[PDB]
Symmetry: D2
Subunit: 96 residues, 4 copies
Amino acid sequence: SMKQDQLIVEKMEQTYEAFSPKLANLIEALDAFKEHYEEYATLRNFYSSDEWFRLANQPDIPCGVLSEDLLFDMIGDHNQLLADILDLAPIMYKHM
Amino acid sequence: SMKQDQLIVEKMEQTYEAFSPKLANLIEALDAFKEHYEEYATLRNFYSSDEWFRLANQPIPCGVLSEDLLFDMIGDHNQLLADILDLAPIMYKHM
Amino acid sequence: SMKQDQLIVEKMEQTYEAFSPKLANLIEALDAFKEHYEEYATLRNFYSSDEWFRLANQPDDIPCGVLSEDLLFDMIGDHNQLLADILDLAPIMYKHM
Amino acid sequence: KQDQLIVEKMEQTYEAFSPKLANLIEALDAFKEHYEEYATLRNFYSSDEWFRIPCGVLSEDLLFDMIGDHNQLLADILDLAPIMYKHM
């Protein structure tokens, strides 16, 4: 029936409108993350380095980059993001 | 010694402050995309169905029955998968 | 106890022995696949070419046969399914590092 | 007759390549079949029980190197995936 057709299309339209910005936002966020990736590389190599440890043992006080957890947590976040991405890839592959 | 240190630190701090929100934003955007994925599944199965074609070819559609709205959405999804597959090995080397 | 320890260890040793070569073989097979990947690329681009279709409708017929109806299609299908399996495996391996 | 030349080349390319695909497929799925053994060995290595003539599984490096090999295989797989994705 025509009215079924109408309902069905209106429902799809609303579904598109709720979904599409989520796709656009992930695309944009991924791209920006990629553009700034060297900053993560720099910060990660800084944290491993002997220099970091030297500087973390100053005599004030450590809240940022020399903090106990800041950079460790950033890396933890990065690594957990990688997991989430790895879980998503096979699902996306089955919906191409 | 304690002025050169300050300058090294100030550079790192600035690097963190430029970078960290990009990480947070990607985390959040990924999660929201995941949460709404079934909507993409639904739309994708709608587009490939005979019903879509019947509905689209009736007697103009700028939405879901338009010529390329959903095609482009799938195209965008598929290109996002490619970018994700390129990013994974890079991230795997910086854990 | 020492005897019980020895039996636990023997079980692990066997587990290593059963498993280790499956790792080593996959590593070797992967590498060889990578090395020969251009052969797949060539064959794939041949199959999707207009030339393939022309040549498949000629009267040599039928070799069974790079010009066969499904040889190269199946090879691509196998490649694609291999990518799926790889994608499913990656997250599992990521949780056992 | 250009044709027969071209075909012969492809046929030879297929015959060189196809077993490399089959072998990877078969190696992958045998690795899958036996994955729980890797899991068990990995959890064994990290355990308190493990602290306890030793050249095999109780060796300094055997299990460490196995994990190292596993982890490098993952890297190689992650590199391969995007390439395969462009040739479907």
